[PDB]
Amino acid sequence: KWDYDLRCGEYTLNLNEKTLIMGILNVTPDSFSDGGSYNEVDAAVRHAKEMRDEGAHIIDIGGESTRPGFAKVSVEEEIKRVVPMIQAVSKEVKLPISIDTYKAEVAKQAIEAGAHIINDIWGAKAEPKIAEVAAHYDVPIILMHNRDNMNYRNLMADMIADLYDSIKIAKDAGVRDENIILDPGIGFAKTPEQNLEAMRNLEQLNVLGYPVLLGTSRKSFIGHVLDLPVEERLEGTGATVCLGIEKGCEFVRVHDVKEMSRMAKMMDAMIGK
Amino acid sequence: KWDYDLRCGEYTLNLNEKTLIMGILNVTPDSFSDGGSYNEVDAAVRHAKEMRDEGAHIIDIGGESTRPGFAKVSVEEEIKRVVPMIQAVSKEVKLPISIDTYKAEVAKQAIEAGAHIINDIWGAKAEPKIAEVAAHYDVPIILMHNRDNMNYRNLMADMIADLYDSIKIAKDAGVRDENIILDPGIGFAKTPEQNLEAMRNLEQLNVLGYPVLLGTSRKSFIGHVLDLPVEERLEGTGATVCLGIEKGCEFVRVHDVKEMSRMAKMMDAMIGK
Prior knowledge:
It is classed as transferase/transferase inhibitor. Keywords: TIM Barrel, TIM barel, Transferase, Pterin, TRANSFERASE-TRANSFERASE INHIBITOR complex. 2 copies of one chain form a homodimer. In chain A, about 40% of the residues lie in helices and about 15% in strands. Chain A has 9 helices and 10 strands. In chain A, helix 1 (about 40-55) crosses helix 2 and helix 2 packs parallel to helix 3. The interface between A and B is medium-sized, with 26 and 26 residues.
């Protein structure tokens, strides 16, 4: 299916042998410091090691500007927090690292500090220069579907249009097809019912011809269906991962690495991946 | 899709609103007695109550002749064991009950004692009279794919042929289309690789026009894929349930009711069931 591998500097990810598991690392910020402290970075490192041990192929690192928190915090402050995490994790965990930011300057620093992949929840629409950063360092970029409203004429057709606008921003800036990954942005700019509909029709994203990353871990729409709180969302996350893999997804972005990684492996055997 | 409901005497199961969860009850036999003892029947009742509380729609009860044990034990002995379980569970748990037997005489007793559905792992081929029993009491019968060898020319085509031979035995005896359910007999008479292939092509069973029950809970082929023992098979069972539901299955037969029931509900929301 994929006649290339994803090139991540020192690491290389094969897109055909198995669904790739991206493990979610959120910063736990120390109060009393703007970042780089022992408790903070060691908590990040320890968690990356656990996820590596549990089958994660990628460690995804987010500062405070990004999901789930969305704090109004400067690029100056975000760098003092996010860079020390990347330096330590990249040194101590032999796995590619993605930086979960929409900010061009943060992406740049994160890669200088050792990050291999860019993960943008705004699909290069919040800060287009991020695509230029991506183009220059020659790294993979994940363009997630998002927008500032839920006014859809035809959900899927609009998602594909919206995504394609991100592909065009990325390609105009010099990003090669091989460094583009798409993400349907489940849990963003969608009603619960639209989240379900997006999941039901995920296979449509495949006609754009790029690898697809699915990120449904623990999200709210699972709670809406099961009437269950965030810490009891394992089975529902599971379902979404399984359905995603059946519908052709190459990556899933998850908090519960042990469990989701086992489900992914079993799905792969069944569908013949 | 289904223009009828499954009629189970006092209970009625709708085949369109949701995937129906069949909870597995295996007898724990008291040594020192041939059945009906307090410890044995109360353990069965307590377990049926838990599964009912955890979202099971059907309680499936098996004596010693059936899976997983396969003991060489008489119909006289099997009845003294299985009947007291059915009497107590039917009285104390307001759920339809299926009797997991291939034996015509056991099926008969089990229904007289209060069982509502027959679950035959031999598809009415080990004891054809079981279809006559089914026809007479006018109850649903589950015909599982099985055979005494793995000599397949074309797995799926043979399964469908084999199943159709069971449909013909059942219909000749007077069983109505509406009381026939099929089961692909995953984990029976199949290599691990054939089990995976059957799962990959499950949607083909739908052309026969009958509801399909899937029973993959904790089975060996999941262990073969994950290299994991029976008690760590939750994620892998999960995958199989999810894939089955995506492929149109109406029932799943599971040990871990809480978990599988949550996954089923989420799958249903996503595929629009």
